[PDB]
Design a protein around this ligand. Structure first.
Ligand SMILES: N#CCC1(n2cc(-c3ncnc4[nH]ccc34)cn2)CN(C2CCN(C(=O)c3ccnc(C(F)(F)F)c3F)CC2)C1
Length: 293
């Protein structure tokens, strides 16, 4: 519906997050021009191309197909530039990315909250798996915080739909790749699956429990292990060699052994032995529930 969010009633409020190929802004949709309206988040491309706008169309269809408490809410599209461009309209979640929230609001985060966020992320990912969607970019930078009690997967720009007959998607046009969240078979064979999302979730869980101490981020920790001197493809070569022979991110300071064990099971080089997101949500909620109270 091109009349749902008309570009002339979509008012700027704040820049929220930008990268090489996309940007998100806070806007107010005020159809009555009475200084009221709901606040929304607006994603738009950067350095657009025909190929990227086609992908963005796929991204929009993917998000529109998703309705879940732990998936950011799709609201519509703005066909801006006189209906010669595309912008994606989403609900606005006010505490930003989980990566920033962990750093900025340590005062209101304890292990209980971390497990609750863990559970919620797994449940959102269970849901994606029922659509045969592979996220491919799971990281705390792409999780959003609605409030102290709820997080949602917040971006789907790299998400792919599995082929009808395969359980993996083989990417044949790799661009910007978050290699320090990648499963080994994604690095070596460009294969992405629910199981490689589980690998990446293992890194998310690590992130949560490092509390995003800059020296403990996965890129920083892997580069320390690889050698900070290394540059270029040599980094990838050493990362692959490291992972294939059981090199792993360390247990974070203060992390319970049981949570670290979940991490290490997600980081299984044997794809089929990785737990499912349903296993993980149940396991985490049972940890939470087995506590006193
Ligand atoms: N989550 C999360 C983190 C982000 N963010 C989301 C809010 C927010 N805040 C409050 N409420 C909200 N409601 C809905 C969103 C939202 C703030 N920051 C940063 N991310 C954007 C810029 C950087 N990005 C690329 O450069 C990029 C790289 C490769 N491919 C693509 C493409 F186009 F194909 F998709 C790209 F866009 C990725 C997209 C989303």
């Amino acid at each position: 519906d091109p009349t749902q969010f008309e570009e002339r009633h979509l008012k700027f409020l704040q820049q929220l997050g930008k990268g090489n190929f996309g940007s998100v802004e806070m806007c107010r949709y005020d159809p009555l021009q009475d200084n009221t309206g709901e606040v929304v988040a607006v994603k738009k491309l950067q350095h657009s191309t025909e190929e990227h706008l086609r992908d963005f169309e796929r991204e929009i269809e993917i998000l529109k197909s998703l309705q879940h408490d732990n998936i950011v809410k799709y609201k519509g599209v703005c066909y801006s530039a006189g209906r010669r461009n595309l912008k994606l309209i989403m609900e606005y979640l006010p505490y930003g990315s989980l990566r920033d929230y962990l750093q900025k609001h340590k005062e209101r985060i304890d292990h209980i909250k971390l497990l609750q966020y863990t559970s919620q992320i797994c449940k959102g990912m269970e849901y994606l798996g029922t659509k045969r969607y592979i996220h491919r970019d799971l990281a705390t930078r792409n999780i959003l915080v609605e409030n102290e009690n709820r997080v949602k997967i917040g971006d789907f720009g790299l998400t792919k739909v599995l082929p009808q007959d395969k359980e993996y998607y083989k990417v044949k046009e790799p661009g910007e790749s978050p290699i320090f969240w990648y499963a080994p078979e994604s690095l070596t064979e460009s294969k992405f699956s629910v199981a490689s999302d589980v690998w990446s979730f293992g890194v998310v869980l690590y992130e949560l429990f490092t509390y995003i101490e800059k020296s403990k981020s996965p890129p920083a920790e892997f580069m320390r292990m690889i050698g900070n001197d290394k540059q270029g493809q040599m980094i990838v070569f050493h990362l692959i060699e490291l992972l294939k022979n059981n090199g792993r991110l360390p247990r974070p300071d203060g992390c319970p052994d049981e949570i670290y064990m979940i991490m290490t099971e997600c980081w299984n080089n044997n794809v089929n032995q990785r737990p499912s997101f349903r296993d993980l949500a149940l396991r985490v909620d049972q940890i939470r529930d087995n506590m006193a109270g």
